[PDB]
Design a protein around this ligand. Sequence first.
Ligand SMILES: CCCCn1c(-c2ccccc2)nc(-c2ccccc2)c1CN(Cc1ccc2c(c1)OCO2)Cc1ccc2c(c1)OCO2
Ligand SMILES: CCCCn1c(-c2ccccc2)nc(-c2ccccc2)c1CN(Cc1ccc2c(c1)OCO2)Cc1ccc2c(c1)OCO2
Ligand SMILES: CCCCCCCC/C=C\CCCCCCCC(=O)O
Ligand SMILES: CCCCCCCC/C=C\CCCCCCCC(=O)O
Ligand SMILES: CCCCCCCC/C=C\CCCCCCCC(=O)O
Ligand SMILES: CCCCCCCC/C=C\CCCCCCCC(=O)O
Ligand SMILES: CCCCCCCC/C=C\CCCCCCCC(=O)O
Ligand SMILES: CCCCCCCC/C=C\CCCCCCCC(=O)O
Ligand SMILES: CCCCCCCC/C=C\CCCCCCCC(=O)O
Ligand SMILES: CCCCCCCC/C=C\CCCCCCCC(=O)O
Lengths: 295, 294
Amino acid sequence: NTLRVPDILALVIFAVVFLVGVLGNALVVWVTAFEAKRTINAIWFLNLAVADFLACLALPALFTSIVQHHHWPFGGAACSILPSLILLNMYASILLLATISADRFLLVFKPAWCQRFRGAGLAWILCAVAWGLALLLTIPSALYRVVREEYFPPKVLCGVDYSHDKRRERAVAIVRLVLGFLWPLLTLTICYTFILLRTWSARETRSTKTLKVVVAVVASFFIFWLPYQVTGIMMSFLEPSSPTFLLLKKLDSLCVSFAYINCCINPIIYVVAGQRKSLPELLREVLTEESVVRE
Amino acid sequence: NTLRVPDILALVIFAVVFLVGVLGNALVVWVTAFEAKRTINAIWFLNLAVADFLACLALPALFTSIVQHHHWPFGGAACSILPSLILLNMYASILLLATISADRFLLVFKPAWCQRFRGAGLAWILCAVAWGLALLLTIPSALYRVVREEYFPPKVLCGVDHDKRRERAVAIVRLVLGFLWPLLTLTICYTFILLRTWSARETRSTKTLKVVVAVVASFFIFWLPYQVTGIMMSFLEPSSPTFLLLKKLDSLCVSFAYINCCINPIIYVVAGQGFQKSLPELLREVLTEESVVR
Ligand SMILES: CCCCn1c(-c2ccccc2)nc(-c2ccccc2)c1CN(Cc1ccc2c(c1)OCO2)Cc1ccc2c(c1)OCO2
Ligand SMILES: CCCCn1c(-c2ccccc2)nc(-c2ccccc2)c1CN(Cc1ccc2c(c1)OCO2)Cc1ccc2c(c1)OCO2
Ligand SMILES: CCCCCCCC/C=C\CCCCCCCC(=O)O
Ligand SMILES: CCCCCCCC/C=C\CCCCCCCC(=O)O
Ligand SMILES: CCCCCCCC/C=C\CCCCCCCC(=O)O
Ligand SMILES: CCCCCCCC/C=C\CCCCCCCC(=O)O
Ligand SMILES: CCCCCCCC/C=C\CCCCCCCC(=O)O
Ligand SMILES: CCCCCCCC/C=C\CCCCCCCC(=O)O
Ligand SMILES: CCCCCCCC/C=C\CCCCCCCC(=O)O
Ligand SMILES: CCCCCCCC/C=C\CCCCCCCC(=O)O
């Protein structure tokens, strides 16, 4: 009859993430757009903002579906596109964050390279490549979701359809777990280990506000993606009949909801980092630092 | 009983491609491997040759199957792997050709960037990414492939695993990712490059560029009939006579696509004679050219 507590909590988090995410990320795009033609950091934060904004658009449909006990009245096109937006957000944000991390690394260890080659056009090219690879990785996820009808009780479910549930679905879970979480975790941990050791050690090299901001965003990625990944592979290695599988499936909306916090956490981090100046001005200072002075 | 004309033609093409492909690409690997440590072009051509060599390994099985009227005696594992090696060849080849085209572009338009960043380790990293992405693209096709028993007459068939509406979109995604998008992008790329090398005397059209342009053209030339017949069959009814005709022509299309796995050495030898020596010597001059002197 009435909704379960985890689903309710997922609805609350969904609402908050929708408001803060849509308005906040839109404000970020507005602030960074004018400075995006020259400043590199502005290009980074701009792309992260667009990626977070697109995922928020799918929220009202997921909300309506959860209120209707996972009923899906939006059709097959929405079934293929709307759920996939956050997976697209996952790959796009982690790719852009990898590029930004390479930027922060090179600024610290190879200033000479950055003085000669760190231009806006290269940044836009790398961002375009990131979006391309992200969409490429998200395509199978869009193709293989279908709308199915059930009768006990009657309901219309939007879900993944793989006849080889044991063989192929586990492969999807493995690919997502590795490309989306484990590999980025390893490489970025090594990267910021190097960077932070050098920053703490040498007085001549400073910790810029941009570095602290990027570190907070990178941490937030893994923090809010962890439960969805863990439960996600766990539901590939479990029998459907098993009680553990039942529990995790009853927690699914809550995990997706926790993952969606990535789409609104960035404006919070930017504002907190910025703290006699207006909010857009604060964002403009935090998100448009020049790393290489030229004029 | 007797095979149809297209199937015999496919057998002949598979034979020629197996011989020229295995021996030629193996020799190209032998030529480029010693220099792949330092010169980047040798890395490109080495990865290309490996990709075209792997596809030929599955050729004898496909040959044997076509001789037996498309009966499949090799089982499910071979059914999932061997037919799809040509697909892995498709994706790996077009990805490597994409990075190579980006290299030919950067050499012409960004000499200064090439001076600092065109290193062997980066080229090997990009090759690793191309191979991994190619495998990742080939996996879903392999999983859908399956053995299928039939009784009138008895026979074992290897084939794809529904939803018409979904199957159409998947076929369109294959046509775009494997052909149309690479066609558009590479066309624009070499439009800029060739227009520049033609306009400016200071800019030279190097031997490596001519070779690479030839290979890139050969890709679309040989993959075209297969892509067209596939996208056509996905949008046609089985009851349709033209569908049946395309179904008969499938082996010939696979063979003509398989020419991609043996035409590369032919191109290298033709170009090497064209500039005007032992075969390995010619291949070494053509495939190990250094674009940045140090
Ligand atoms: C600057 C981001 C690099 C992404 N990346 C990571 C990467 C690192 C940290 C976090 C996310 C990705 N590991 C490897 C890499 C892996 C093996 C060998 C060589 C390179 C790569 C190289 N990738 C190709 C690429 C090149 C240039 C790009 C690009 C992607 O977008 C922006 O400009 C391949 C790739 C792309 C996305 C991936 C991934 C691998 O695993 C996790 O998700
Ligand atoms: C230099 C290779 C470029 C591949 N590519 C093509 C490409 C071009 C011509 C031929 C083949 C691939 N179009 C786009 C691209 C697409 C949209 C926006 C920005 C870039 C891309 C960027 N891709 C990332 C990547 C892949 C493989 C790599 C790599 C980076 O460095 C090493 O090896 C994503 C990608 C990879 C394979 C694809 C594809 C997209 O669509 C068709 O097949
Ligand atoms: C899938 C949606 C991805 C959308 C992300 C891209 C956002 C579009 C906004 C701007 C892109 C075009 C900006 C190109 C500026 C190039 C000139 C320059 O800055 O040197
Ligand atoms: C799948 C792995 C996920 C776990 C996180 C990875 C654990 C290792 C992380 C960082 C170890 C890197 C230590 C590098 C030391 C640098 C030495 C120096 O800077 O002087
Ligand atoms: C119950 C789980 C909720 C946890 C919320 C986590 C929010 C993540 C936000 C920021 C992570 C910590 C930021 C640390 C900044 C590091 C700056 C520096 O190292 O100099
Ligand atoms: C909602 C359940 C999880 C709790 C999430 C809490 C969200 C906000 C909490 C902390 C935000 C931390 C922001 C850190 C900004 C670092 C600024 C700096 O660089 O100094
Ligand atoms: C997006 C999926 C891409 C697949 C991941 C790539 C898998 C390859 C992993 C490691 C290979 C790295 C080896 C290259 C190191 C350079 C060696 C050298 O300098 O000689
Ligand atoms: C998607 C379009 C791909 C075709 C463009 C060529 C691909 C080359 C890859 C990267 C080149 C980016 C540099 C472009 C600016 C220099 C070229 C110019 O100014 O004419
Ligand atoms: C007939 C096949 C369909 C058309 C395919 C298009 C292929 C065009 C590709 C490259 C052509 C480049 C255009 C400029 C050529 C200039 C040559 C020169 O002047 O040196
Ligand atoms: C140049 C490759 C770009 C994509 C071409 C694919 C379709 C064209 C196929 C065959 C036509 C040959 C076009 C090559 C023109 C070479 C002109 C020259 O170098 O003299």
